Amino acid sequence: PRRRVIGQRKILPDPKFGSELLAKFVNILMVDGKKSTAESIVYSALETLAQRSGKSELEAFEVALENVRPTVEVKSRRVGGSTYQVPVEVRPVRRNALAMRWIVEAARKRGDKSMALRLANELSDAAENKGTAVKKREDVHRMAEANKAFAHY
Amino acid sequence: KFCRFTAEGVQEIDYKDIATLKNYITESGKIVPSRITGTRAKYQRQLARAIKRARYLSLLPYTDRH
Amino acid sequence: RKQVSDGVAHIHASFNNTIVTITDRQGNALGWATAGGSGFRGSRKSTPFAAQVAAERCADAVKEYGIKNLEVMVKGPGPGRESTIRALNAAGFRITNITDVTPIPHXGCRPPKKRRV
Amino acid sequence: PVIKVRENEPFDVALRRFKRSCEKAGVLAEVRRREFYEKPTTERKRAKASAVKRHAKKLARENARRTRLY
RNA sequence: CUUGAGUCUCGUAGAGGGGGGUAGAAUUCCAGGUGUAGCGGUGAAAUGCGUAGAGAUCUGGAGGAAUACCGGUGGCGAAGGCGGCCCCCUGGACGAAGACUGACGCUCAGGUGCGAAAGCGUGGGGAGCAAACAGGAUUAGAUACCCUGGUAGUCCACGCCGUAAACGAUGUCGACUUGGAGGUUGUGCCGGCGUGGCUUCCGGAGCUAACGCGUUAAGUCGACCGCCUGGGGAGUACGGCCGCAAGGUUAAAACUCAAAUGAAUUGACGGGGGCCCGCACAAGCGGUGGAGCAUGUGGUUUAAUUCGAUGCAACGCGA
Ligand SMILES: [Mg+2]
Ligand SMILES: [Mg+2]
Ligand SMILES: [Mg+2]
Ligand SMILES: [Mg+2]
Ligand SMILES: [Mg+2]
Ligand SMILES: [Mg+2]
Ligand SMILES: [Mg+2]
Ligand SMILES: [Mg+2]
Ligand SMILES: [Mg+2]
Ligand SMILES: [Mg+2]
Ligand SMILES: [Mg+2]
Ligand SMILES: [Mg+2]
Ligand SMILES: [Mg+2]
Ligand SMILES: [Mg+2]
Ligand SMILES: [Mg+2]
Ligand SMILES: [Mg+2]
Ligand SMILES: [Mg+2]
Ligand SMILES: [Mg+2]
Ligand SMILES: [Mg+2]
Ligand SMILES: [Mg+2]
């Protein structure tokens, strides 16, 4: 807004492992406010991945976030009617927001039977740089690098 | 500031004393604005004339980078 | 092939482009590069960053001569003046002198007419 | 302007002395004024406007100092 | 008769004028060296130039035009105008204290001279720039604005032209009427005190429709000249004069209108500016537009498809 009087909102910690990261992630995965179904799909997926990995849920999911977390994105900007993609920095919280969002979407458009399975093997291949989401980290990174010569106004 | 040629009452600025003209030319070679030095108008005109004369006689460079 | 150990690098910084020509003391060129020749056209070719990349690429392009020191001729208005110098300095060249070589008519010839953009 | 990167000189401050010499020498000034032709009447107009606005600014801030803002 | 007007002597400042010479920076072109895929240009592009070696960088050469810095609401000139440096010929201005003439003055129809830029004639010159022109874009079109080129011209000598928002839109000469801050150039007395010439800004009285002007008057007077008499037609036609021409000058009528005009005021508008707000942008999340259906609307049909709402602010509206 024109004001910057936005305080921060409180968000619940997760029951299974006390992770607000999982609460944010489930709030992204959620549709129509069916929060119980979202948390259940997600705990299912993270235990499927905690077995197909063995690391942990918290940690397999952090390993999927880091390998997908991007560090620089572009920002549209109009100069002479021409529209400039200017690579700006990101605060850590926008990094993980983007990571979780891209991951949920690249899992939504997958082709397994259920959705918890899509998210499980998505976060797995995310951790191994074979998923659409690390691909979008790649696209955003090379998008910032190409127009990096505009790293100024 | 303090215009000098009136202080000592010089009649004519005499292109020959380059060391004098040395102070009213930039080290790139350019005459320095009379506003910046505080020289008086008549004397700044004598200054410009003598500097251009000593340039023609090649005792001062026209520029820093001949 | 040969070695000089001492160079003079000419920077042609225009508003549209930036050219970095490396010669020897007597003006014989060793190598060169340009912002447009480095993967940028139009907007980016006229940026300090493209100039910088062109300066480092021209550094690489004179690797085979073992030059260490460089005088610096900067020519023209463009923003590619300082970025190219820092590129040549960070590249591993020991800068020794820096001279601005922009032509200044002491009148001179009539410039083109103003653009009515 | 010529710049001597002196003994023991950090390159960045000699860069800045270069910047100062070019800025007070009038180099970008001259290139941007000389890029295009100027009608004599046009530049007489512009110099006169510069000087008149400068003297008007002088006397404006001269009448200002003798007033209280609040 | 000497104060108006003018002459003589010392000095001072200035891009005043005419003629010749000379210098540095820079552009373009030529000869060659190095060197290698670009350059150049634009809002973005293309035309154009470059592997037949461009651009870049260096050395040498030719040529033309203008004179960065000084530089300044600084100066000089009747005005138009005048700017590197040197020399020759030349006009004027102002200052200081005198000597001289003795109203010799002011203005000026007709006339005569000078008179930016463009233009014209003859003969040179031609770097850069650039009407015309050509191509490349832009656009609905684009005979433009932008880009790449480019000829007259711009330069010189002589002659012609005689017009400009040739403006201070303010005729010349003379006299008088509070101030303040500066610039520039003389000069008297000792940084201080006087007196002159030119000149920038603010402002009093006064004047003015107001805006403003205001000792450099648009204030208070006198002399003389030019000019105006509603807007359009029209500074046009015809005729005279002038011109090589382009055209200049002098200069109507019929006819038509009730206005056209100036200054200032309140709004509004601006692809003027400054500062702020709003699910207005950005960030997001979910919808509509596609399908089946409900309903309203329009329109067609009908005897009737009752009448009304019908940009936002009508269309699940009166209902
Ligand atoms: Mg141009
Ligand atoms: Mg007459
Ligand atoms: Mg002419
Ligand atoms: Mg001719
Ligand atoms: Mg053109
Ligand atoms: Mg007239
Ligand atoms: Mg005029
Ligand atoms: Mg005028
Ligand atoms: Mg008039
Ligand atoms: Mg007369
Ligand atoms: Mg006044
Ligand atoms: Mg006529
Ligand atoms: Mg006419
Ligand atoms: Mg709201
Ligand atoms: Mg949005
Ligand atoms: Mg539908
Ligand atoms: Mg009715
Ligand atoms: Mg109805
Ligand atoms: Mg109706
Ligand atoms: Mg409704």
Swiss-Prot record, chain A:
From which domain of life does this come?
A: Bacteria
Look up the coiled coil feature and give its residue ranges.
none
What InterPro entries does this protein map onto? Answer: Ribosomal_uS7 (IPR000235), Ribosomal_uS7_bac/org-type (IPR005717), Ribosomal_uS7_CS (IPR020606), Ribosomal_uS7_dom (IPR023798), Ribosomal_uS7_dom_sf (IPR036823)
Q: Does the keyword RNA-binding apply?
A: yes
Q: What does the record say mutating residue 115 to G does? A: Significantly decreases affinity for its own mRNA
Q: Which UniProt keywords apply?
A: Ribonucleoprotein, Ribosomal protein, RNA-binding, rRNA-binding, tRNA-binding
Q: Which SUPFAM superfamilies match?
A: Ribosomal protein S7
Q: Name one GO biological process term.
A: ribosomal small subunit assembly
Instruction: List, alphabetically, the Pfam families matched.
Output: Ribosomal_S7
- Keyword check for Iron: no
Q: Which GO terms describe its cellular component?
A: cytoplasm; cytosol; cytosolic small ribosomal subunit; membrane; ribosome
Q: What GO molecular function annotation could you give as one example from this UniProt entry?
A: mRNA binding
Q: Which HAMAP family does this UniProt record tie to the protein?
A: Ribosomal_uS7_B
Assembly: Part of the 30S ribosomal subunit. Contacts proteins S9 and S11. Cross-links to IF3 and the P and E site tRNAs.
Q: What does this protein do?
A: One of the primary rRNA binding proteins, it binds directly to 16S rRNA where it nucleates assembly of the head domain of the 30S subunit. Is located at the subunit interface close to the decoding center, where it has been shown to contact mRNA. Has been shown to contact tRNA in both the P and E sites; it probably blocks exit of the E site tRNA. Protein S7 is also a translational repressor protein; it regulates the expression of the str operon members to different degrees by binding to its mRNA.
Similarity comment text for this entry: Belongs to the universal ribosomal protein uS7 family.
Q: What else is known?
A: The strain K12 sequence is shown.
Q: What is this protein called?
A: Small ribosomal subunit protein uS7
Upper lineage ranks? Bacteria, Pseudomonadati, Pseudomonadota, Gammaproteobacteria, Enterobacterales
Q: Which gene encodes it?
A: rpsG
